[PDB]
Every structure is written in C-alpha cells, then in structure tokens.
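Exam prep: given the inputs below (a chain plus zinc ion), describe the expected output before reading on.
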Amino acid sequence: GSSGSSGKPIKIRGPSHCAGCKEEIKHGQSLLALDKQWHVSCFKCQTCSVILTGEYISKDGVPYCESDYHAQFGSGPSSG
Ligand SMILES: [Zn+2]
Ligand SMILES: [Zn+2]
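Solution:
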C-alpha cells in the first residue's frame, strides 16, 4: 500500500491585506478604519462609495459618509 500527498504554498507574504481590494499593503500605504487596513484610494462609503479622509461614520462595521449615514439612520420621521 502506498498513499499520501500534501503540500500547499503559504500566503503569509506581507499580511494585513487591504480590506477593500484584498491587496497586500507593503509597497503602498494603509488607512486605519474599523480595526481594519484599507488603501488611500479604497476606503470609501458603502452607499455612495466616496473616499473618506476627513470625517466618516461606521455602522454595523461599515464605513459611511455624513451624507448617506445621516440619510440612512440619521433621517427618520417627517420632522427628521
Ligand atoms: Zn485597496
Ligand atoms: Zn455615502
């Protein structure tokens, strides 16, 4: 009897991959947000997809701008 074969490449090359494009952030830069690491051109709203650098609001673990966010949970009833 002869059986047994294993061997897989380790993808431990430059960890902390971009949580937006899934790309190793070694040659470029990263952005701290939601306990994650995103590129300077990847971190943007989830509803409008607008680059967030100045101010932003995170919801249920999702980056949002003062526009959508305030329009999603910010606005409610008529007088909202
Ligand atoms: Zn990226
Ligand atoms: Zn937005």
